[PDB]
Amino acid sequence: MEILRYLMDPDTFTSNFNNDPLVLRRRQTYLCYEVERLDNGTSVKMDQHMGFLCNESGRHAELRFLDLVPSLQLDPAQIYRVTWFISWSPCFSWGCAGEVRAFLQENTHVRLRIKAARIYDYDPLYKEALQMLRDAGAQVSIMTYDEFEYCWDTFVYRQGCPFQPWDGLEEHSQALSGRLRAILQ
Ligand SMILES: [Zn+2]
Question: Where is the active site?
């Protein structure tokens, strides 16, 4: 879904990206993506390569992004930074980490930056997933206030309304980042 055509409902964003542990949004993932062409030491933003995806009929959003990479028309002679703002860290047991790993092996012109709102520890191999992504070249981190507000401002039908932080955004982000950094050693 291209933000040029459709922006995300605000409550869809809040419901899915809130990082409070006691709220349980296990059913869905929202993956906001953007692309930049790394040109000789500079980032060239590609405004049309921006959108968001959710799981659809059992197909995880991470696989659906890989599905559309061909339509992005990336030049394999160039270099690109793909950034994911994703509500859940990619999974291992349903294939996302392996598929993303394979994509990065055979698409070396792409560098993946994954910023996750929450760790998907419902997957018993969530740690194996994070390590496989790191070992594949992806830089994985936890979203902070800065990332949440950027996604609000970029991907949401907010109508000039500024980002309204949920309670404890900062505390949960710190704890999640400490967990992630420990996992990735
Ligand atoms: Zn998955």
Answer: 62
